[PDB]
């Protein structure tokens, strides 16, 4: 009596982005939300596409449980999904990796520190070293 | 038929007559002259802090025989000195000498209320804490 059933309303093709856009209306009684990865797979074999060229987001389980609604897209190829989707969706789905970024404050600190020096700092480092030498 | 002019081109004198008559009111004259900012102990201020100078009680009027327990407070914002009234049974002892006290209006539009002569200000807070919390022993004076 689980029978998670899925529907794609307002589906529009879009070769401008080589995609198919729709709103995901998922009916699921006696159950919590649909755990996106599982519904991505469901749309994958629903539209005859790989689990990589399918994306869902913006979900909202309506008041009182049961129905839930989100937005979904099906890309023509996995490469197009790679080259068109935002980085954070490619991180959610495991097809990309979080970029090793320093925090914003440290980046700004380093930007100002680079501002302090005109040109490469190769000369000034040795100059200062031999300066405090004497 | 009436003192005011009635012609269709008599807007000027009607307007200036109303403008000259408006000064007969007290609220309008106070608002336009700005007497509250210049002469009142607070300038358009509902509340004001101050420092207790001494600890006096004033007798009441004729039909009411008692001594209301007030306190003389020098205002910190400008330096004026005003008497203020501590409102409750056992709140005089709560306020001590030379402590910051937050005075408020007395509720009668800056005029003496009831039988208490020459006072126009309540006492709401003492030393950062309120009188009402002290009177019901909900908070205690920090004694600093």
């Amino acid at each position: 009596s689980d029978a998670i059933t899925i529907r794609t309303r307002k589906v529009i093709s879009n070769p401008l982005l080589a995609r198919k856009q729709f709103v995901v209306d998922v009916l699921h009684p006696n159950r919590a939300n649909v755990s996106k990865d599982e519904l991505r797979e469901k749309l994958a074999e629903a539209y005859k596409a790989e689990k990589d060229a399918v994306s869902v987001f913006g979900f909202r389980t309506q008041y009182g449980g049961g129905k839930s609604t989100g937005f979904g897209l099906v890309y023509n190829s996995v490469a197009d999904a790679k080259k068109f989707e935002p980085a954070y969706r490619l991180v959610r789905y495991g097809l990309a990796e979080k970029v090793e970024k320093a925090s914003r404050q440290q980046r700004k600190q380093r930007k100002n520190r680079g501002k302090k020096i005109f040109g490469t700092g190769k000369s000034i480092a040795k100059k200062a070293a031999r300066r405090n030498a004497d | 038929g009436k003192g005011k002019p009635r012609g269709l081109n008599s807007a000027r004198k009607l307007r200036v007559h109303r403008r000259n008559n408006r000064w007969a009111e007290t609220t309008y004259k106070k608002r336009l002259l700005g007497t509250a900012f210049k002469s009142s102990p607070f300038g358009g201020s509902s509340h004001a802090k101050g420092i207790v100078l001494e600890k006096i009680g004033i007798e009441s009027k004729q039909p009411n025989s008692a001594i209301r327990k007030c306190v003389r407070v020098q205002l910190i914002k400008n330096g004026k000195k005003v008497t203020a009234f501590v409102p409750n049974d056992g709140c005089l002892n709560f306020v001590d000498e030379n402590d910051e006290v937050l005075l408020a209006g007395f509720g009668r539009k800056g005029k003496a209320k009831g039988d208490i002569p020459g006072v126009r200000f309540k006492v709401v807070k003492v030393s950062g804490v309120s009188l009402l919390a002290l009177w019901k022993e909900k908070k205690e004076k920090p004694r600093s």
Binding site: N30, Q62, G64 | -
Partner: protein, 182 residues
């Protein structure tokens, strides 16, 4: 700076706060329909007053005037859709004759009481507040809800609720577990 969205008051406390007859009538209406506060009657009176200001303004306008037609029949269709104004008196002159009790009557509280699934008005209030009644498969935990004519036929206990058919709940499940264990 982002464009604000306008909050607005929805009630208006009366001028004379200690009218004996008015206070007794307010308590009568609060006890008849299980209203939590007397702000509820103020809110219904404010809604009635807005409707009534619109009605009188449209009445002032001349008969067979586009504003009169359009907005008057819009207001009448909205009120008959709500259900407070009976189909007999769609005239915009009986719309002034509506009373606060009429809008009180269309509350989901009183509707659940009328249908009989709640045998008491306060029982209707709690049953609504416990997420049991669903107006067309949609759970409504809100007593007023201004139940409309077209959807009153679809009030029943929700499927997720034990009354509509589900697991009983905390007390009964715990007692069943205790009985099974001992």
């Amino acid at each position: 700076p982002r464009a604000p969205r306008t909050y607005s008051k929805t009630y208006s406390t009366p001028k004379r706060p200690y009218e004996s007859a008015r206070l007794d009538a307010e308590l009568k209406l609060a006890g008849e329909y299980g209203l939590k506060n007397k702000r509820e009657i103020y809110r219904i009176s404010f809604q009635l007053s807005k409707i009534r200001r619109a009605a009188r303004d449209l009445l002032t306008r001349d008969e067979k005037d586009p504003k009169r037609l359009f907005e008057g029949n819009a207001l009448i269709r909205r009120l008959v859709r709500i259900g407070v104004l009976s189909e007999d008196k769609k005239k915009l002159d009986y719309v002034l004759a509506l009373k606060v009790e009429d809008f009180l009557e269309r509350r989901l509280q009183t509707q659940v009481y009328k249908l009989g699934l709640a045998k008491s008005v306060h029982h209707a209030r709690v049953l609504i507040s416990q997420r049991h009644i669903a107006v067309g498969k949609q759970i409504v935990n809100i007593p007023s809800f201004m139940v409309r004519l077209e959807s009153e036929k679809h009030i029943d206990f929700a499927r997720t609720s034990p009354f509509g058919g589900a697991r009983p709940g905390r007390v009964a499940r715990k007692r069943a577990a205790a009985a099974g264990g001992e």
